């Protein structure tokens, strides 16, 4: 799928090993410390699609299928993906070929879309960088292949940082020489069958800023679909522009701001609020990057914090931002591990409620977004506009005009105190009646203009006219 096709779509991310075992299990034990399989496979993410797709998402990440070393290391097993050793064949652990097109069909079949998690970069090996044996990697069964031996030293020169291993001795990342013809070709004909073969809708690129820049358009181009690169960097002066070679980034400058601004309650509001306009304006196409405030190289939300009504927000936020919204599995169960690997908690463990908050402020987040883009084919395309802000307080507009969703969001907690705030730049007509789609509640807009938003309890407003709601399920 395109760029284009791709702007609508929401993403539930998973780890592959620990969202569902096929014998759909809700005990099987998983100490995260212990990095090993915990036995999630392909099969049972499909049998678990009906709790994925009533959160009102169109599409899952997973993490990369290939075969990965076997060991179990000093550091686990490769139970995460990221350490490959033959790209040719399946990593057994989550079943079969056929197992993964059937997923992939599955999706399909819902109108959903697959996107899986590819690294180039890298082999994985259970050894000394020194001592690597180059036999045992398919197809880069020798040397030849690979940067010569190095660690990052200082990450401010960019040639080290594309040219010298990630990792370290006990479990080292031998770094493919990207600049090679032979090592490009190699890749960019896998990529291309990769897809084809398992009718792959987008990718997932890992480290991307390990890799020199001239690597990517042609890695692009190949894999045929949409591809969103992690690059691990906070400023958008770095990262924004690896999209002149990739058709979207995952959205770490939003994250940083976005995670301090809901984290407390003594956030920053304005950091949030200006790095959206300097991603707007800098960024070659925001409505293409992915939001998240959560994944498993982070501490999860619910680490800083407990209190279920900030979560609530940033959650709101992530949805409906600009580009697409990116949600890892476990978040919305409200946990909270820390860093890797305290933040891979089996998604299982918890049992699937389908009525916890946070699975219910998603789903209606979601219903919303989507109805929208039914109704508005602008939507997306509608660069979000931050209208309104304060030291607790951010507001922010999107969609076509008479079409708009106008959204509220508060880090001031569960235990907020109850009142009313005025909204001008709303843009909604004088005496417009808005549903208020969280909640469920209505309100009418001023004569002056302004908006009489009832704020309590730290609560997420989505505003949306109440009107276009007609014929949809939404608020019923
Ligand atoms: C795709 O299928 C062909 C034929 O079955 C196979 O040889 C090739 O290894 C597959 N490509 C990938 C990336 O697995
Ligand atoms: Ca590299």
Known sequence: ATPADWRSQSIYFLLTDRFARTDGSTTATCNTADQKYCGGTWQGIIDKLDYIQGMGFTAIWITPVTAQLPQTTAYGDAYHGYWQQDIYSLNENYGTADDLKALSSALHERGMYL??????????????????????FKPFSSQDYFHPFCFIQNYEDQTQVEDCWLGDNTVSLPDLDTTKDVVKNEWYDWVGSLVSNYSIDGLRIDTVKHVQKDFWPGYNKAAGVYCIGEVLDGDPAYTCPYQNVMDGVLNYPIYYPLLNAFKSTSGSMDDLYNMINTVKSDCPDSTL?????ENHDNPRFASYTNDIALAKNVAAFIILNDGIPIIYAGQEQHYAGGNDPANREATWLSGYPTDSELYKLIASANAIRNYAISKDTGFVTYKNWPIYKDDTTI??????????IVTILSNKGASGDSYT?????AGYT?????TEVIGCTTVTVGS?????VPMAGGLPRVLYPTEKLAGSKICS
């Open 115 to 136: 996107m899986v998690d590819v690294v180039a970069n890298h082999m994985g090996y259970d050894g000394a960088g020194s001592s690597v044996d180059y036999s045992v």
């Open 430 to 434: 004088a005496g417009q009646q808005l």
């Open 421 to 425: 705030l005025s909204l001008s730049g």
């Open 395 to 404: 507001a922010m507009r999107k969609g076509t005009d008479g079409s708009q």
């Open 448 to 452: 002056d203009g302004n908006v009489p």
């Open 289 to 293: 990057l992915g939001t998240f405030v």
